[PDB]
Amino acid sequence: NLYFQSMKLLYSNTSPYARKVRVVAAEKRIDVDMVLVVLADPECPVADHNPLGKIPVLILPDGESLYDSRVIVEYLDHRTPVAHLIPQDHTAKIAVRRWEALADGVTDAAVAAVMEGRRPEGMQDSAVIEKQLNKVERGLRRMDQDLEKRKWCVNESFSLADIAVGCMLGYLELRYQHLDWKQQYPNLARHYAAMMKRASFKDTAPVI
Amino acid sequence: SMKLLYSNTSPYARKVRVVAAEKRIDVDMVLVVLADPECPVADHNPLGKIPVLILPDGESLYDSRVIVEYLDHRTPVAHLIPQDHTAKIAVRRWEALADGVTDAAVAAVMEGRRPEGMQDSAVIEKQLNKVERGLRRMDQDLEKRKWCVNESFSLADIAVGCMLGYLELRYQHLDWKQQYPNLARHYAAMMKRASFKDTAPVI
Ligand SMILES: N[C@@H](CCC(=O)N[C@@H](CS)C(=O)NCC(=O)O)C(=O)O
Ligand SMILES: N[C@@H](CCC(=O)N[C@@H](CS)C(=O)NCC(=O)O)C(=O)O
């Protein structure tokens, strides 16, 4: 194998969960071998590192792999003292992980909708799409209310929360050109504005 | 006091229940039923998913991973999540793997609940495969161990239990206590726990 191997982060160009991981990596200022991957492919078999078959996976120099994104992001925030993506104080930290679950949950709902539309032409269910896009709208409204008088999601400091909300919104933009959220959720668009101003964030926009 | 929204069969919620019991925490239990409308769930979790913990703040916490962490810091004297970073990460990662197998298993059930006319063959194969791979890995990781991490009972063990519990409910056909001996042992040891058997699905 190889000496002086860096941590490797398996990822795809569209995965918002991968993006959350990449963004945290940059914020922590951690050097990481970022490996663009194709899930189907034989040459890099994800299943050998993540049995679930899901990206992102962080493969450490031991050859031991961490997934899912929620685990990986706790691991990395502890690597360097650059910033506390996850607050040390328990109140703030549960607050941070709650935001993140809301954001990931909305993303799960969008992925659900999106994939639902990709089913074979016969076996596709408009109700499923409706329900999921329902979770999205409700989640967005809630986040938007929570950012009325706030610079950032928690305690007024950039955290995993903000990152998660960014990756989420960016996912919406990627998958739903016609969603005009910015206008409907002014606090969120403002937040997204701040986020778009970070290389970490902007440097990782989905593509392809 | 606090309110837990759960259902009879949710393994995600059974995980919090088991934690609460393990931790000796007295949560007001709020039954949700599958035919139920969006609220009261959606009122407290915008994603309208169970489980969700409500605090005397009215504040609501979700999902199960967030709740268990909040629950575990409630009673200091005994942690189901290691305070030490390395053991914490390894536990969270067992949980992630177990939740993920539950995910795939629930999805396949859901794909089997579709109009026979709108079932995707590829999806069920695809999810099951995930299941066995999750189980194969998990049954080797336990090859010479009693508990998942540092040979001491943790959230990881609870997660593994609920997961298999869920397969106990929805996948009779699988003979996994047969291919995954270590999982079998883990389950029986889990079974023997009050916290675990009081939270099994009523049928
Ligand atoms: N719970 C996992 C989910 C990982 C996941 O879903 N990754 C891929 C699927 S393998 C993804 O983002 N797919 C959606 C897309 O790229 O559009 C995590 O949070 O990391
Ligand atoms: N991933 C979450 C939620 C799990 C979940 O989806 N629970 C199901 C019951 S088994 C649910 O409430 N589904 C309702 C819906 O998606 O509308 C967790 O670990 O708490």
UniProtKB/TrEMBL annotation, chain B:
Residues 84-203 form the GST C-terminal domain. GO terms for cellular component: cytoplasm. CDD domains: GST_C_6, GST_N_3. Pfam families: GST_C_2, GST_N_2. Glutathione 2 binds at residues 49-50, 64, 126, 130. Residues 2-79 form the GST N-terminal domain. Glutathione 1 binds at residues 9-10, 50, 64, 166, 170. Keywords: Transferase. One of its GO terms (molecular function) is transferase activity. This is Glutathione S-transferase-like protein. It comes from Methylobacillus flagellatus (strain ATCC 51484 / DSM 6875 / VKM B-1610 / KT).
